[PDB]
Every structure is written in structure tokens, then in C-alpha cells.
Amino acid sequence: NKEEIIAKAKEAITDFDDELAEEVANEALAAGIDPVELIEKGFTAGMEEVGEKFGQGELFLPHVLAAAEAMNSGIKVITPEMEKRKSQTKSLGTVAIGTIEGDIHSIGKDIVASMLNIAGFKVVDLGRDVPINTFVEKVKELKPQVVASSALMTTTMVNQIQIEEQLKEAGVRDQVKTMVGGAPVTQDWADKIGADIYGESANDAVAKVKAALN
Amino acid sequence: ANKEEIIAKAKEAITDFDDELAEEVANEALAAGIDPVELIEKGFTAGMEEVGEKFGQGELFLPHVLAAAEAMNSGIKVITPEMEKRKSKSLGTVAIGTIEGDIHSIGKDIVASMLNIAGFKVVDLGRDVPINTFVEKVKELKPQVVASSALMTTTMVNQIQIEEQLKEAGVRDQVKTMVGGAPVTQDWADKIGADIYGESANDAVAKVKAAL
Amino acid sequence: AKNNAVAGFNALNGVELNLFTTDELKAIHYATMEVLMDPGIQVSDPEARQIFKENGCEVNEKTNVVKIPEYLVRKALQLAPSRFVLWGRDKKFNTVQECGGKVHWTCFGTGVKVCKYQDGKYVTVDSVEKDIADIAKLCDWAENIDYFSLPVSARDIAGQGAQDVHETLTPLANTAKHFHHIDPVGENVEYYRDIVKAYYGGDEEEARKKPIFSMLLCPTSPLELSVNACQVIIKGARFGIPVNVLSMAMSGGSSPVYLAGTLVTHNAEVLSGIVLAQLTVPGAKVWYGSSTTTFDLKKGTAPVGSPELGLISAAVAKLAQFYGLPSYVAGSXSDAKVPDDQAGHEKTMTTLLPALAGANTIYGAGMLELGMTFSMEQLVIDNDIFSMVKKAMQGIPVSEETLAVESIQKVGIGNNFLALKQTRQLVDYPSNPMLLDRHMFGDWAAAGSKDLATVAHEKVEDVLKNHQVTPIDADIFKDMQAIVDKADKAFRGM
Amino acid sequence: AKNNAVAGFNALNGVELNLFTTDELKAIHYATMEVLMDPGIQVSDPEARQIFKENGCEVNEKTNVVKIPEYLVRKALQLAPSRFVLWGRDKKFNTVQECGGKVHWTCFGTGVKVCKYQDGKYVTVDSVEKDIADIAKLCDWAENIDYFSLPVSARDIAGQGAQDVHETLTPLANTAKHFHHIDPVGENVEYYRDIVKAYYGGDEEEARKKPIFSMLLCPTSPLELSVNACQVIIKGARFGIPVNVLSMAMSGGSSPVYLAGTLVTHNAEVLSGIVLAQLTVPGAKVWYGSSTTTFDLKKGTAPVGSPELGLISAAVAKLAQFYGLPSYVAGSXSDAKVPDDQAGHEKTMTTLLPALAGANTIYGAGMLELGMTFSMEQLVIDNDIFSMVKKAMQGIPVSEETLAVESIQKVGIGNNFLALKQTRQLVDYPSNPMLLDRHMFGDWAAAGSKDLATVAHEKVEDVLKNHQVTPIDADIFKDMQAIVDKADKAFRGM
Amino acid sequence: AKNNAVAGFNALNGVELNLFTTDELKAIHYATMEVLMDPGIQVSDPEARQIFKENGCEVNEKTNVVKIPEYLVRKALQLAPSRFVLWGRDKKFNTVQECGGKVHWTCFGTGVKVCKYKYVTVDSVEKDIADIAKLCDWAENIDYFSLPVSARDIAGQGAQDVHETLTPLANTAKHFHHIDPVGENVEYYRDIVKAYYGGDEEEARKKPIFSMLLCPTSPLELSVNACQVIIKGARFGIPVNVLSMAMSGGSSPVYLAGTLVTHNAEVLSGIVLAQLTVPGAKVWYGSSTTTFDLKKGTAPVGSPELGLISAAVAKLAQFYGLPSYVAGSXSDAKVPDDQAGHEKTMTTLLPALAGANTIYGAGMLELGMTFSMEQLVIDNDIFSMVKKAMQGIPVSEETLAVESIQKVGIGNNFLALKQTRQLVDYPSNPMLLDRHMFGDWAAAGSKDLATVAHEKVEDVLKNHQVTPIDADIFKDMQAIVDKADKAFRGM
Amino acid sequence: IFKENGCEVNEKTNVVKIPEYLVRKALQLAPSRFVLWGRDKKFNTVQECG
């Protein structure tokens, strides 16, 4: 059974079907199966098979997200039984991401979020126009390895400094490595601001996130 | 690949109606030195019979039946010389064609293919086939049955001459004749004293098997 | 290499049928605006008369005649939505009604009798609430029957309760498709609203957003709206219930012998109904409808399977398109008393024209005996006819792929296309009728030498027996059933 | 349910570009028939003059001027085929040329110089027979280059042998695509016939049925056919070799400053050539061709990357369509001396117009320096530009599926379409350029901050290095090679 | 004698380009009407939500979703004017914007960087806006000015946007189209235009020298800012460009048809809100919408898709009776090379032949991140060639010129002709594009368009005189800018 | 008859290739209409393009 529940969880993701992703997460609950087992032996297995083809140039962005959407359709089905109740953690880094406050551009942030999710990391999307304070509150509440903000304007890119500050005066700036990315964001900005990582793109961000903690 | 995989790729070539795939497998077969008879019998024929089933279950129709017979022909044309340089199974051979003065043929081609997929080795004489050629074929191939197709009441009549000239050559007593066509009925068959009447292709098949 | 870059190309997708030129549509319009001022329209309902008067119409209280100025016709047309969605109990049965050529079919309504074979002899028995239930099940099954229309009258409820309210729950209970009430009662529209409100758990906002119920009304030809008609319109607009303003004039009878003049009459009647709807509530969902036909001066009957009905329905569709409104017309109708050669002819004649014309809803399926009877046999036959009609409507697609030159060259002279990849992949494209017999004599005689009617009948028997309709939640049903009971009590209290 | 039955719908597939009304095309036609009678056309070849005279034309033997009556223009047009297939050595490279909007591209011809890479930067060196071989290989690779056209002159064979015959075997040997000879010689047309005959194992009937060789000729503007032009036409028609009658007038120079008047001039010249072809052999395959441009009165040069060239080519395409003939026009041409911002602009301007207009063959790809040079870098860049142009030509398909309302509603407000099934299935539909850079600064700078030209160049290097062209059978090649040698001997015997 | 009396004759003036039939246009309209009901539009601003609600739209206050009924689109359209005139300080630079095929060009906006030519890019600042204004003021094909690059330097030290309003009107006499305003600050812009006209609000309204753009948040929703720009725009009589910017495959369907349906709904909903706030309000049905590159994870704005969508939006606008403002002459290139020229031409020729009333993009590079002053004058040179091409082929007895053909005869040339002389300035004559033979070119530096362009930039920026605003008036406008920074620092 | 007018005729396969100019020629020659007479003139029926 378990082997079959992991065979499905994988098929669910390589096939890009949210339903089956919920089905398996269901027959999974109806077996007492540890959800963390399903999120790794089961879903991330297929998650990583896609990224594999993504790397060879067989599948593209569409497939990454479509697969990430499935992994979430399943994880949703068991978020109650999971961490909420049992309170168990997954593995392979934890990155909190969202578009800086005052900014609603989200396409990019969502692509970075998926490329990470598919790389093997646990992504926590904070949404967009995320108020600076929420970044901080989510950092000490979730205690993630990486905190990422996205800014696509020169006027919302400036708010990334505030993430650095309010994080320092929260006594957690040293508890997590920050990352900055966006069309106007550059390495110089990352340095000048004091950000740990600079994401040139979704691939560069994934490569640097692991090279920074992996 | 190993014979096992080649035999499968040969069945798939048929179930997918893919001539190019049937030809490639035939080459993998000849290259491996594998016997053509095992490629045909356990390979194409396997996939050929599968189509016949799905056809008998209304899941597939004529387009599929003729395509499958053709995918198989492609791959066998390749391994033909081979089978020749080594010598070589059908439920029995069937020789068919439309009678002289009749260029109708879509059906004859369908009855013919509805047989190839059943098992019989069909020998298509074409269309507008003069009576003589019909007779001069019974003596050469000696197939289990000589079938004719008339769609005109004017050419339907020629179906008699096939009788009055196969007895004229002491060969009638050998092969069972068969007539079919829009204008052809069971009576007309009984009248000219033919062996089997072909209602439709399916029927013709079922009836040719009746002579087991 | 093979071309894959072509400059602008003009194409005609499907089959286009024309009856008028802009000048001609304008002629009919002007003639109608003329008629709307003289003799005008008689509005019996005082409340409607007031709504007309409040907006600028001249209203003579002694004669009750209303003269609608063209600016109000224009205003009303700017307010009416070009489209709206008819929801089914099942979302997959949702049907869009919009200005254009998107065609849909619905059965006819409402017969007073129902065909039923009895010992070889053809037989018609007066309709009862149960017949509505059977017909509703059948229609739920028919794929070319987009939505359900009150097929026959619940005669057995007449005088015992609120017939029209029974004629509402029964259909809704036996079909997951949208229901169009062919014979609503102005006074009881609240009950319909409540029954639909119940279905949606008392959520009136939901009932308005996902209308599973719509209703029809007929202007009294020539040129007058009855009180019931006005109430259905007014209440309909206020309760967010799609209304079908369907004229029913007759050439030589209640309108000119000339079809064009009959259209002017029909046009005035319907537009006034539509104007009322928009003045009551701007943006009210409405249909420009018609069942107008020609009165047979030589037979003193109202033939509804004639070529005139097909032409008028086709014309009304063109007019609706011209005014920017969805159309609802008669089609697939027959005067035949039994499902014979005549039914087949008339049904195809009266359906093909309005379909090729672009009528958004064509009602008539299942009809016989000039609208007096409903035949389930005929209903499944019509459903099959619509598949054939849908095929004809695909016209002749012209592209490099369809021209298939490479296939022709590949096959070559004297060979066939049976084994081509092309042919197999498209095995499901050609028309494939469900009931129409295409076998040769032999196979046909062996199946029993059955005419279309008996074949249809065996199909009806099979469908009524094995088809499953998405039932309504038993609890929700109780609430809906309650409203019907409430309506019945009130009826007895009269 | 969901609609699946729509009435007649009018659609425009692709992008339609208009320059004239029927009245205007008629105006140009009448103006041409006028010009064909006065001043008429000077036909230098006596044999052609005879063919004209034998059919009804007035021929002045002292001036050699021919006056072609309209009925012969009409007759010729009824004789010329609306389409013909250009065969490649490889059947998959077959290209159809037919009256209409089916567009195809071919490189330009013929430059006398070639852009190269020496001690840095791209320089220009006079062309040699080997350059034709390289360019032929490159073109064999370019997917948007339907067929090969003599790109540059085999200058190194001048005076040593039959240049034009070398300019025939070399291309045929280095490309499996059809070859169009941009600079044939009347006297040697037999050699081309023989080389193509050899290729087909001496089967002349095959050579005629599967023409892998076609040729061009230019009327001497204004209004006169040279002896060479007449011989190419006459021999071409008699040997079954497709002929491209391409005028090359210049506004302000050899024709009016006004584009329309220039078209009249161009029209007379080309039609006379076409008339000759049809009178020589009814049904002879011909192209209504043009490279006519505007003479820069202020620069004393013949700019071929101007908007006038694009307009004239687009107009000639419309004219060809009007007369029922396949068109061959200039496009993707530039006056730029180096592959810069200007090349890109001009190349796109002169290609977009004739493409949107429906020119059946657009030649110019790879050109630079007003036709003097051929740039392989520019050639692959143009090939990429054609992919983009082909995309633009798909216009905006409008159907229920493309309107995608259910997708929009499914995704809802504030979400994206990246994960929809719809989006994935169509991942290959959007334009996907091979060379045009779409990366953000970072990725681009990391790849080396390369401009399009260097990127194109690396591609050229890669193609010339790794691309394989279907070689001609070594034995067949010997036969073909023989004819070239035979032609060379004769040349020395002169 | 010769005919001087022809009967009914049908002619085509210019070049007509078609993408749709009436059926198709309607196909897209009906689809937009379904979408306006579901899911509908999310209007964040509560002031905007009330206007909609006051007029019939069913507004859900919990979700902020507005379902605009089709009759409000109609009413809105019946109200929006079909034409209006943008004003510059110099009437000669005035520019009409009307429903039809009257094409005009404006520059790109807004870049964060500025290309300086080797070739380097340096984050923009208010001084850059001053030059481009000088350069764009000189560029003849650049009808009006559009905020080219953000003054990042004034960012955080004052009202960046109010500064971005004074410098443009200062260094240019042409209409000024603000590509990125702040709703909260519209009052300032009004006061700046008002200050220019000597405090005569009537003059400011009657002769708008300042217009502004706003973007719907793709997909299907208007932000508080977009709404405020519209609403305020309509009360103050400032022309508003409601320009959406969806992305195929990203914020909208991969198909272009579907992407027009989403684009349409957004824009209309904006135009509906403008006409409801103040009927007869001047608006633009605009678009920069394009296709998102699924294989490059970028938003190419120089693809043939942007060219099509722009041309398609132009036809839609005509359909609806409104002026169009669309993306054109754009490139994804990072340097002025072959690709820039190609894309710039592809994306400009389509909407031009289609009829776009305003085509912005000139000067662009790198998908809109940079503004090249070279590409800007190259672009302006490309527009001359476009205008030429747009003249199509005039066909008259004069242009068929039979007598000229007959006068010149066989084997001669038309150079010595009077007709050729008099028409010397008619044929295209590019200012930058090089048409010399290799020899003369090479004898000039063997220079490519880029450098020849940069040489021009330097010459224009050094010798071009812009008409300055009178000192009295300027101080009054500067004051307001100062009052704006005051407040910024205050808060 | 086909060969005599310009068509390519392969005598071994009996295949004829008809050039478009002959299709055009034939169409210019064929009458757009003709009358089918009956034994009774009143039954005359016109057959014409249209």
C-alpha cells in the first residue's frame, strides 16, 4: 500500500493533476501514513523528476508550477493532520518568500518560489505587497533558513532595507540569511543593503540558496 | 533489443497502425537474425488479432482494420526475401476480386481485409477480373475459396460464368465459391449454386469460417 | 519546405443563411415604430401602464392603449443584456443565450395530450403531472436538448391545486437541466422565486446569479399585452428571472397575410414587452421570441410545420440579432398526427431554417398534432435530427489540411483512403446517427424490419428505464415541496 | 450544455494588407495596355520578334519595337499556370508557387563580395565559386529559406570557363533544395537542361516533371527585352524550366517618380516577357517578378532597403494575384554596409510589407550593401526574422477556444495561467526566436554581452561545421560534372 | 480633349491592415461582457466602489468585486468623447487623438537606467529626463513627450512624481504624458498646469498640456491608485490613458484572443469608472499588453506578439469609438544592433498600419529597463520610413503618369524630367539611415547607425533650443513642486 | 483528343495530365445554359448557371 501511495503521489505530480494529488493525500490519511513521508518519499520524488527534465530542457516553467500546484493540492488535503496536529517538520531548508510591501508584481516571485519548491526546499509564500512587519513576524514565528523579498520597482526596492533593519532590531537578523531579487535589484544593492544573497533569476536564486546553506 | 522486446515493438507497430514502426522492427528482427516466422506469428499477428477484438467490440472500425493489415504488410515486405531464402500459417487461403465489367471495389477490399485480420491468407485479384483469370487462379493457388464481388445486377450475372467454367475445368469440385454484393442475395447464391453468400464483410468472415 | 505562412485569408465558418439586407431590416423597424405609435399597444395591466406613462409614453386611460416612442425602444435595447446564462441544477447543463448564431434546442410546450402505443393502435391520452416527470427524464438524457421546457399540462391538478406551481417543482425535480416555464401565472411568480430560493438554501442572491428557472409570456395578438403577460414581465424583471417575450401572431389571422407585415406586428408586440421589462428593471434578462406562424386560410387551422413557420422563425432570429438580443423561436415542429414521413419532413424544414439562421433556442422537439400532443418517440427522433443538423452546420471547412492534396496524391489513382492515418483519426467526425437506419436491406430486415418510430419507441423505453437523473438533496427538496403545498393551500382558500 | 452549433460566421485568418481597390488595379492595367501600344516594347532578339509577329503583334523591324495588343496579354494570362512546384533534390524541400498569399523566402542574388572574418571584425572579399558552396550549405540549413538562389558570382571562373555553368552545378551539389539561377545566360541554357537531365539519369521527362532548376531574367528598363532575356524566356519555356520574369525599374530613374507610374512601367515590361513565354509554349511556368525600387534622387544611389521597395514588392504581389500569377519579389533587403541597427530595420520593413501582402517568394535574405555583398551572419539573422514574421502572419485567431473565457474564469482575479493545462499544451506556440536575445541583462552579460551579429556569426561557424547536406550520387555527379567540363571546353574554344 | 470628368471611383488611401471581421470583434466583445460578470473586476478603492454601486453594478464589499453590467459599458461608451486635443506649450506641437487611423508617436516610459555611449548603463536621475525632453523636443516624429525615465535621485527626498512633472514641461514644449503618477498627488499636477496658465483653471482644462496613464492590475482588478488617477483625472479634466498590460501565459490566456478579452475587460472597467465619475471625460483605450516568454521567464516586449496585440487593441478601440494608445517601436535588445532595429520595426509597423492613435516605445531597450538616446533618434528616423510606407501607393491619372512613360520613351531615363525635379522631396529621405555606396560611407568613418546616432544625440543636446516657460510662471510652478516636497518631508 | 490539345499522356499507364489552360479553355467553351425539351413544349426546362 504505502509503496502504492508513494507511486501515486509521484504520478500525481509528474502528470500535473491536482485532483489525484488530493486523492492520494486522502488514501494516505486513511492509513495513518506519516504525512512527512508522503511529502518526501511521495510528492518530492516526482517533484524532483520534473526539475530533472526542466534541467534537460524537456519541460519548462509551466510544468514546474503545474507540478508545484499539485504538490500543494495534496499537502493542503493533509495540512490539518500534518504539522498543525502532529507538529512535525520536513527537510532541506525552509525559505519564506513574498513581494515587498508596496509592490504587487508577483509573477517573478511565484516563479522563484516554485523553482525552490522543485529544487527540494520548503517554500512559504507570504503573498504580495507583504508589509515589512509581516516578514519579521514570519521569520521568528517560522524561523526559516532564508527570508526572501521581491521588488520590481526602484521605489519598492528601497523597502528591502527596512527588512534588514526591523529584522536586526528583532534580534533575528543573524538567525536567518536574507535574499533580494527583482528587475531593478542588483548585486551592488544586495551588498550596499547588507542582504546575504542576491537572486539574478529563479535559477540563480536556487543555486545561491543551496550554496548558501546546503 | 532482445527478441522479447522486438516482438513487442512489432505488436505495438500494429496496434498503432504505424508502417514505419513495423519496418524498423522488421529490420531489428533481420539484423538480430531472428526467425521471420516468429516475428509474424508472435509479433504482428498478436497485434493484428488485438485489433480484431476491439473491432468486434465496436471500439474500432474499418479505418483501423485496414490500417493494421497495412502496418503488418509494410513490416512483412521487409522480411519477405528472408522468408524466401529459408522457406516460410493461415486458416486457409482466400482468392477474391470483382468480376469483369465491374470496377466497384471498396467493399471487396473491405471483405478482403476483414479476412486478413481474421487469419486467412487473402489473395486479392483486383477488380474487373475476367472469368478466365478467376479459373486460372484456382489451378495455381488452389485456395480454399474463390470469392467474387458484383454490385451491379448486370455484372452479378457473370457470377454464373465463374461456375460454368470452373466445372468446365474440373476444379469447381475443389474450391468453394462465394458471391457478395449490394445486388447479391442468398437466393442468387443458391440459384447459381455457389458455396457461400456474403451479406456483409463480418458475415462473410463468419461464414467462411463456417467451412472449417 | 511546406508552406506555413499565409497572408490574410477570408473564410466563412459554417453555413450562412440570409433573408435580409440592412435596408430591409430598417424597413421592418420603421414600419414597427410606426405601428407602435398607431394604433399603439393595449396594455391591460394598470401597473404596467403606469410604468410606461412614467417614462414618456402617451397613455389613454379609457382605451388603455399605450403609444411607445422610438427613443424608449432604443433605450430599452441599450439596457437589455446581449447575453445571460441559463443554469441547470447541474453546472454542466449550463446553456448560454447570446446575440449571435449560437444555436440550442429545447423541447416544445405545452401539449394537453401525450402519445402512448396501446395494442398496435396509436393512442393519445390527456396529460397529467406524471407525464411531465417522464418527459423531463427523457429530455435530461437527450444531449441535443439543451434545456427543459414545460412539455405538457398537469391537467390532473387543475381545480385541485396550483397547477402552474406543480408544473414547476415536478420539472425541477426530474431534470438537472434549466427549466423554462411555458405557461407561468403572473399572480404566482413569487412561488417560482421561492421554490428556486429554497433550492439554493434560501439564498436569494444565489438564485439570481444562477437562474435554474426562466419563464415565457405571449403578447395577445394583435398588439396587446394582457394583465398576466405584464405581471410575468414585471415580476420576472424584479425577481431576476429570465423572461421570454414570445409573440404568437398568425398570417391572415391576427396579422397580415404577407410574412413581412406579420413580422412588423410580431415586432411591435415583442418590443413593447421588452420595453416594459427594461423600464421596470434596467438590464433585465429577456428573449426576443417567436412562435408566429401562418394561418391556413384554406384549412382554418394553424399549421405549425409549414415552411412559413421556418421562415418566420429564421427571420425573427435575424431580427433578434439586428436588435442585439438573444432569440427563442419555434422549430422542429409538425402538424402530423403521428410520427410518419410528414413529421420527419416538417420537423426538418422548421428546424433547418432557424438553425442555419442562428436562432439561439429552437423549441418544438417532441411535438405533434400542431402543438396539441407530445410524443416521446418523436422527441428522441428530433434529438437525432439535431445531431444531423449540427453536422450540416459545420459547413465545409476549407484549409490546407482539409483540402488534403497530399492524401489524394499519396493514395493515387484507383485506390481508396480506408487505411490512411488521416481517415482513422477522423473516424468520429462524419455524422453518426443514433436512430436513423443506415444499414442495407438485409441487416435491417434481420433487426426486425423496423420503421423509425418503433426504433425510437424501444429507445424511449430503454431510456425511461435505465437513465439516472441527479436528484435534488432530500432536505432541500422538502423545502421546495413546502412552497408547492403552501401554494396549494392558498388555492383552496379561494 | 456547452454550445457546439454556430450559424455562419465570417472570419479573417491571418493578417490582410490592402493597397488597392479593383478600380485602382484596373487603372494600372489600362495604363499598361496603353503603354504596351505606345511606345511599345523593344525586343532585340529576332527570334522573339518573329514569335510576337506570328501571333498578331505589330513589329517595326527598323526600330525593333513590338506593340502587344491586349488580347495577347489576355491570351497569355489564360495560358500561364496559376501554380507549379519547385522540386528540390530532396522531396521534402519541395516548394509550391501559386497565385495567392502563400509566402516563401529565398536568399538574394547575386553579390560580388562576401563579408568575412579576418584579424577581427567582418570585412569584404570578392566572391568565388567556393563562397557559393558555403552559402549553399548555410541555406540548406535555414528552415525559412524555402529554396536556394544564386547568392554570389563565381568571379574566379570568369574568363577561365563557363561561369554560369559552374554557378549551376556548385549550388545543386551543395543544397538538396531547389535552385533558382539569378544570372543565367541565354546561350548556355542547354547546359542547365543537360545538367538537370543528367541528375535524373538522362530522363528528360523526369527533369521536366520535377524541376530542381529554375531561372530569372530582367527586362531592360525602361520597356525593352534584351536578346539574353528573350533567349532565357524562349529556351526556358521550351525546356520546361520555370522562368522568373523580374523587372527592375527605378522610380525617378528608368520609370516615373510616382510609385504607380513605376508599376505601369514594371507591369508592361513583365507582361511582355510573360506574353513571349506563353506564345513560345502555352502553359509555360512563369513568375510575375519584381525587384523594382526607387532611385534616390538626393544620393544618386539605388537604395533597396527603403519603404518604397517594400511597397512596390507588396504591390507587385497584389498585381500578380490580380493577374492570376505566382509572384517573386524583393524583400528582407538592406542598404546597410554592416549588420547593424539599420540592417535590422530595413530587412524587416522590406520583408513585412510583401509578406503581409502575400508575395509567393521573397528574395533578399543575406543581403547587405545594396546587393553588392552577401553576409552569412545577416543570412541567419534574416532567417530568424522570418520566424518572427511567420508568427505575426498568424494574426489573431478568434474562436471560442482562443477567446478562452472558461480559462479566465477558472484562473479568476489576481492569479496566473502558468499552471493551466491549456498553457502547457501550447508552450511551443508563442514566438521562440533562435538568435534574437530575450534574456535580462544579467544572463545576457554573462553569455558575453554579445550583439546579434557575433551571435549570428558563431551560429554560422557552427552550421558550416556540423551541418550535413544530402550529397548527390557520386556516379550521377560525374555525369553532371561532365556537362560542366564540356561547357568549359567550348568556352576555351571561343 | 482630355477627360476631366470621371464617374464614381473607389479608392484606398494608404495601406489598410485587417485582423478582424465584425463577427470576430463582437466575439471578443461578448466574451468581455461575460467576464465583466464573472469573475468580474476587483476595485480596491472604496470611492470607486460607490460610484459603480450608485450606477447599477452589484458590488460585493467583502471581496471588493464589482460586476459591471453591459448597459454601463454601453452608457460609458456613449459618453466618452471620440476625440480630444493634447496641448503643448507651442500650439504647433498640439496633437489630436481621435477614433480612427490617425497615427502619432511618443517615447517610451519609464526606464530606471540610461544608456550612455563604449556602451554603459547608469541608473537614471531627474537630469536625464531633462535631456531626453530636449532630444524628444527636437525629434519631429515624436508628437508628444511621455515620462521616459524615473528620477531615482529625487526618490525619498521629496515628491518624486511632482518633480517628474515640472522638469518635463520645463525642458519640452510638447504635450506631456505622465507614465507614472501618484493618485494622491493629482491635485499637485492640476496646480502645476494651473500655475502655468496663470491660475486660470478654465485654460488648463480647455488646453490640457498634461495627461496621465494608469494600469489595471492584470488580471481583472483596479488598484486604489489606478482608480484615484481615473476619478481625479475626470474631475480635473486631465486626459487619462487607461492602459492595461497583461501577459499571455502569465496574467492572461496563452492565446492572443483570450488575452484581448482580459485586456478588454480591465480597460473598459476603467473607462466605465471614468465616464461615471464625469461624463464626457477624456480617456484612451490603451495597451502595452504582450506575451510572456514561457521558455525564458521574461516579458519580451519586442516580439511579433506585442506588435499584433497593439495592432489588435487599435482595431478594438476603433470598434468602440475611442482613441488608442499602444506599445510600438520596442526591443528586448540590450544594445543598438540588428535585433533592436528589427524588433523596433516589427512592433511599430503593425500598430501603425493598423491605426494606433499613439504608439509609445521609441528610445527603449532591454525590455523597458533602459532608455537609449541613440535608439530614440534611430526610432524617430524609422518613423519617417514608416510614414512613407503608410502613404501606400496613390493611384490617379497623374501618378500612373502614362504621358511621362510616353515622353521618356524606350531606353531613356526620367532624371531630366520636370516631374522628377518637382517631386524631389517626395521619395523617402532618411536622416540617419545610410544609403551611400561603400566608398563614400567608408570615407566617413565606416560608421554604423549606433555611432552615427550618438553623434547626432550629442549635436542635438548641444544645439537645440527649447521654448522656455516665462520666469514669472515658472516660479509659480516651481513653488508647487516645493510645496509638494514640503509635505513629503512633513509626513 | 487530350494529347492533340496539349496534355501529357503516358501510354503505358494511360494517365493524362491536364494543364490549367485547358481547364480554362474548356470552361470558356461550355455554354452557361441550354434548354431540355420535352415531347410537350410546356415541359421545357432551362438549365443555366445560377
Author numbering:
A (entry chain M): 3 to 216
B (entry chain N): 2 to 89, 92 to 215
C (entry chain E), D (entry chain F): 2 to 495
E (entry chain A): 2 to 118, 122 to 495
F (entry chain B): 52 to 101
From the paper:
The 22nd genetically encoded amino acid, pyrrolysine, plays a unique role in the key step in the growth of methanogens on mono-, di-, and tri-methylamines by activating the methyl group of these substrates for transfer to a corrinoid cofactor. A substrate:corrinoid methyltransferase catalyzes the demethylation of the specific methylamine, and subsequently transfers this methyl group onto an associated corrinoid protein. These structures have provided new insights into the mechanism of activation of pyrrolysine that is distinct from the previously determined MtmB structure, and details of the key steps in the pyrrolysine-mediated transfer of methyl groups from methylamine substrates to the cobalamin cobalt in corrinoid proteins.
The 2.7 Å resolution structure of MttB-MttC complex was determined from crystals belonging to space group P21 with one full MttB hexamer bound to six MttC monomers with approximate D3 symmetry in the asymmetric unit. In the native state, the helical cap domain blocks the β-face of the corrinoid, but upon methyltransferase binding, the cap domain is shifted to expose the corrinoid cofactor so that it can participate in the methyltransferase reaction. A similar positioning of the cap domain away from the corrinoid cofactor is observed in the MttB-MttC complex. This positioning exposes the β-face of the corrinoid cofactor and allows it to bind to the cavity formed by the TIM-barrel of MttB, thereby placing it directly over the pyrrolysine amino acid. The interface between the cap domain along with loops of core domain of MttC and dimerization loop of MttB provide the primary interactions that stabilize the MttB-MttC complex.
